[PDB]
Structures are given as structure tokens and as C-alpha cells.
Amino acid sequence: FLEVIKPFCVILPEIQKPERKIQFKEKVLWTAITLFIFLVCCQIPLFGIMSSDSADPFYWMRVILASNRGTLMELGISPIVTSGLIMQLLAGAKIIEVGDTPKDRALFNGAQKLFGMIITIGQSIVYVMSGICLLITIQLFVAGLIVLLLDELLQKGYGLGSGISLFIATNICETIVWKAFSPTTVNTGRGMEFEGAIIALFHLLATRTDKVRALREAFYRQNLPNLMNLIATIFVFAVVIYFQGFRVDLPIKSARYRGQYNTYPIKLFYTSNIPIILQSALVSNLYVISQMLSARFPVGGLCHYLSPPESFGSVLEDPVHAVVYIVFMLGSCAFFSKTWIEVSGSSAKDVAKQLKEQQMVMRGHRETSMVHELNRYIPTAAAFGGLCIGALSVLADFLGAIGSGTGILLAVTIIYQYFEIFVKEQ
Amino acid sequence: AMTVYALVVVSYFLITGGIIYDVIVEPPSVGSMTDEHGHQRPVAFLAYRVNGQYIMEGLASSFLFTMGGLGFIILDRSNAPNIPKLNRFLLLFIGFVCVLLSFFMARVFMRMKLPGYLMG
């Protein structure tokens, strides 16, 4: 299960960081070179099968990585992300045991590489399924191995955010930015080539007179993106970083050293719910996958308990859908907190054995009363930490200030935790 | 101040790019007429007439120009002095700036040859 495949599969690893340990700004050089790569990495492929739909998971899929039928971004970092996540699951969930010898953590990275590359091969096969099938596979792995090396040289290396999360962040900066200035439009009732950009709402002032009805189209634009939408989008970002700083402080006398107080915190977002939101997302993705098997044996009657009601009118024509959608959102994130914490760490015994394992004892009482010191925080700071994210994403939908909604709130929450992770190693 | 230099280099590709073609604005890239089968593939930079551009042509030209100049700025501002990390950071700086310089001039040479059909 681990003892056999891991010793043989060691082919072409990465080089661990040198003895040039402390530095300020060549750290940022190792960031910026990867950002040159993902200038470059989002660039055109070499095969002329020009298929009609770009990608099938292009929108949600696009939200994760946006080079759909596009560049060497390979439709996602979804290999490294999914392969990292279920690896940390099956390490934390004891379906598979824990390796804490350095040989086991090194081969743990090796198996990480293994499942990552196998999943790249899976995505390659599943997108290509003509006679021109050669060398696509060679390109993809070469560009899978590159994203692998760039991510693992930005965890043990520079790495502060991650390799991963800052790639997602910068590519999301770009996906706003193509909407910010937009040069082309292939040629409505009036007004070509201006769709919810600020350049659009700066070219709009150059074309049309009667600037009152230039303001009105700028601030209450419905079918295209809106700038009131962008104000609400910014507003949500500000509030969510207001709520990331919600943290519980716990000071700790370290064992065997006089009075150093590196206080362990518990933030409410509580791994920022990259389980728990994607818990909320992917069950409602797997049925809208499997409604395709409902066409034979639907987008109508099954939708009334499936989706948000999509309407800015708060009193839109069905309160049943609104109530059940919001209650399902809140209950789903809360319930998947109170079930999630037991597997990917940071439950009561998890925290206790990590702190004993790193020699940190609460001052108030005995070492294995620390459990009862903090067991009256972690479930609620799971559950509330579940709950007032989803209701928060209610405020991401109830008001359309979100470029993409819930998911954008929460992937930038990924970035915000990501900054802490990168900063950690300074 | 040096912010005035920032203002000027900001203005540089801005009026190298498309202030001339603000009022004479020509939309980004599509001009193929089926070529034998496939109808409206967007072509390129304009090639046959020399003075014209599109929005997509001009921005690319401007971007090529200011990165080369600010690469020379980086050669001046850090590579000639000797103060920071004398084996790791410096070598990166000369490395990526020489890459900037060589590949930039090479590609702009290409982007005058192929729209221009000049004997190289």
C-alpha cells in the first residue's frame, strides 16, 4: 500500500533547497521567475484540431484555471490540487497510515508526484477523447512536470503563499483584467464593444453625449457585467478579510523553557473551508453531471431544489427555492464542518497530539486537560466557521458585487490563508 | 523626481501605441475570407499597408519597446553596483535582463520582417 510502490517510483525528483538560507528579496526573485513562466505558460498549443466548445467544464473549470482549450496551463492545476488534497486526506484519514520518517515524507512527495502525473495523463486522455493524436501527450506531461516542479520549488524553496494558490490568484487577476481592458469584439440594439469593463465605462464616456444616460448604463448595466457589481465585488473582498482576522488566541508556556509565549491561534475560517465550500459545490456538481443520465431513463422540476434562484429580485416568483437554497447552503457548510474536522486534522485530539508533539503546554492546567481546555472551541469554530461562510456567500449572491460569486470569495480566501503560509517562512 | 520618469515612460508606449489611432481606430484582428474553407479566422498584425495598425498591433509594439528600455534601466540600477547578494541575486538579474534584451530584439525583428516582407 505504501511499502512497495513508493521505493521503486523515484524517477526524476526535485532538488531540495540550498544553504543560502536567510534572504529578503531573492525570495521574491524565485517568485517572479515563476510569474514569468505564467506569463508564458498561458500561451497557445500546437495541434490544429479546432473543436467547437472550448472545454466542457469551462466555466467552473475556467474559474479554477482559465486556459480552456488553450495553453500549457493544462486546463487546471487540478492534477496537483486534487492529487494533493486526497493525499492529505488519506494521510489524515487513517485508511492509509502516517509516514513520519524522512524517507516516508520524501516518498510521500514521490507518490504525490505519482498521482499528480497519472491524473494529468487521465485529463489528457479524457480531453482528446482523430488521427493527429501524436505528441499532445508528450506536451502535456512536459507541461505537467513543469507545474509540478514549480509548485514544489515554491514550498521547500521560496514558498510563502504556495506555488499553487498564487498561480490561481494571478490568473484570476488576468481574468478580471481581460474584462478590464477589452480590445476585440466580433461585430446589441446599440453600443458595440463595451461589456462591463472600466475601459468600457471609459470608452462609453468618449462615444455618447447626454452623460446622465452615460452614467445610467454604467451603473445599472444588467445583461453584461456592471460597475455597481464591481463595487459590491470589492465590498465583499473587504468584509471577508475583516472576517479572516477573527481568531482565538491561546498563549502557551512552552515546556522546558522559561516563558516564551508563541500563542497558538484558531481562526474562524478554519482551513478556509476549501473542503467545506467545495463540499458545498461538488455535490451540486455531481448531479448536474448526472442529470445527463436523467434525459434518457432535467433542467426543470429537479432544479427547484438544486440551484440558487438567480434573481436580483428578492421576492422573485418562488420563495420555496430561495428558502430551501439558503437553508441548504447554511446547513451544508455547518454540517460539513462538524463532519470535516475529524479527518483533515485540527480536531481536539489532533491539536493535542501536535502540541505535545511540539512541546507546548497550556498554562492553566495539566497537559492532557488541554483537550478540555480547547474542546469548547474547535467544534463551534468548526460549525460557526462553517455557517457564517455560507451565509456570507449568501451575501455574495443576494447582492451581485461578486465577479463569480461564492467561489471567488472563497478562492481569494484561499489566497489570503496562502499569504500567511508563504510569509511563515519569511 | 523619479516619478516624473515613471510618468514619461508611461507616456512612452502610450503614444507609441495608439493615440494616433484613437480617432482612426481600427478593430483588432479579423480579415480572412475563408482562405479555402474556414471563414473568419483572425489574421495578424496588418502587413500589406505599412502605416496602419490595429489596437492589438499597437499595444504589442509598445510593450516590446518599454520592456527593453527598462531592462537597460535594470542593468544600470543594480547590475553595475556590487552591494547585494554577490552570487545568487545578481546572476538572476543579468540572466533575465539579457534574456529580455536578446529575445526582445529578436522578436521585434521578427515582427517587422513578417508584417514588412523585408529582405533579412
Binding site: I15, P18, L46, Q139, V142, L149, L153 | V99
Partner: peptide, 29 residues
């Protein structure tokens, strides 16, 4: 990255893509 070749390696890969992209397109038009 004790060494910088991994980066150089990435550059080589892009060149292989860069050059090999137009290399087959040489015989076409």
C-alpha cells in the same frame, strides 16, 4: 533550486514548444 537549470529547463521546454510549433508549420502555409 540549489541550481538554476530547472528554470533553464523550463525555458528549454518552451523553446521546444516555441520552435517545434513553427517547425512543422515551415512546410505548411
Amino acid at each position: 533550486v540549489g541550481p538554476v537549470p530547472v528554470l533553464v529547463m523550463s525555458l528549454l521546454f518552451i523553446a521546444s514548444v516555441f520552435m517545434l510549433h513553427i517547425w512543422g508549420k515551415y512546410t505548411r502555409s
